[PDB]
From Swiss-Prot, chain A:
The chain holds residues 2 to 71 of 142 of the full protein. There is a cross-link at residue 60 (Glycyl lysine isopeptide (Lys-Gly) (interchain with G-Cter in SUMO)). Belongs to the universal ribosomal protein uL23 family. Component of the large ribosomal subunit (LSU). Mature yeast ribosomes consist of a small (40S) and a large (60S) subunit. The 40S small subunit contains 1 molecule of ribosomal RNA (18S rRNA) and 33 different proteins (encoded by 57 genes). The large 60S subunit contains 3 rRNA molecules (25S, 5.8S and 5S rRNA) and 46 different proteins (encoded by 81 genes). uL23 is associated with the polypeptide exit tunnel. It is found in: Cytoplasm. Component of the ribosome, a large ribonucleoprotein complex responsible for the synthesis of proteins in the cell. The small ribosomal subunit (SSU) binds messenger RNAs (mRNAs) and translates the encoded message by selecting cognate aminoacyl-transfer RNA (tRNA) molecules. The large subunit (LSU) contains the ribosomal catalytic site termed the peptidyl transferase center (PTC), which catalyzes the formation of peptide bonds, thereby polymerizing the amino acids delivered by tRNAs into a polypeptide chain. This is Large ribosomal subunit protein uL23. It comes from the Eukaryota.
Swiss-Prot record, chain B:
Disruption phenotype: Essential gene. Abrupt growth arrest prior to substantial depletion of ribosomal subunits. Fails to synthesize the 25S and 5.8S rRNA components of the 60S ribosomal subunit, and exonucleolytic 5' processing of 5.8S rRNA is strongly inhibited. Arrests at cytokinesis and fails to assemble a contractile actin ring at the bud neck. It comes from the Eukaryota. Residues 1-55 form the RRM domain. This is Ribosome biogenesis protein 15. Involved in the biogenesis of the 60S ribosomal subunit. Required for pre-rRNA processing and cytokinesis. Associates with the precursors of the 25S and 5.8S rRNAs. The lineage of its organism: Eukaryota, Fungi, Dikarya, Ascomycota, Saccharomycotina. Present with 4280 molecules/cell in log phase SD medium. Component of the pre-66S ribosomal particle. Interacts with NOP7 and RRP1. It is found in: Cytoplasm; Nucleus, Nucleolus.
């Protein structure tokens, strides 16, 4: 005989019925990097801890009027 | 053992007086191969804390 029932039962007791696979469709020829988590910085310290001030304020921009004839 | 086969016959060993198990028995399922694979599978099988021996 084949004893297909009983060799299924053999396979059951010896492996424990965890015996199939979830086959995944995979269609792309190329596999790519999964898109994952990307934080932004939370520094324990600032880089320089003091903002530099307005470099380019107006009183510093405008140096001079010209006083020439043209 | 109906998992392994529709049995030809089973018999169990009890005492005849105050009938309780003397811990053995016999079977035929149908086939020689069925008996072989059952024995091969369960020769040294453990359970609650007896273990069966089958031949």
């Amino acid at each position: 005989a084949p004893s297909a029932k009983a060799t299924a039962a053999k396979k059951a007791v010896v492996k424990g019925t965890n015996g199939k696979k979830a086959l995944k469709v995979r269609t792309s020829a190329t596999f790519r990097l999964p898109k994952t988590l990307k934080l932004a910085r939370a520094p324990k310290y600032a880089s320089k801890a003091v903002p530099h001030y307005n470099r380019l304020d107006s009183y510093k921009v405008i140096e001079q009027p010209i006083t020439s004839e043209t | 053992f109906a998992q392994f086969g529709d049995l030809k016959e089973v018999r169990l060993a009890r005492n005849k007086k105050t009938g309780n198990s003397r811990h053995y028995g016999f079977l035929e399922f149908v086939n020689k191969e069925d008996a072989m694979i059952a024995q091969e599978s369960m020769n040294n099988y453990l359970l609650m804390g007896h273990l069966l021996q089958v031949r």
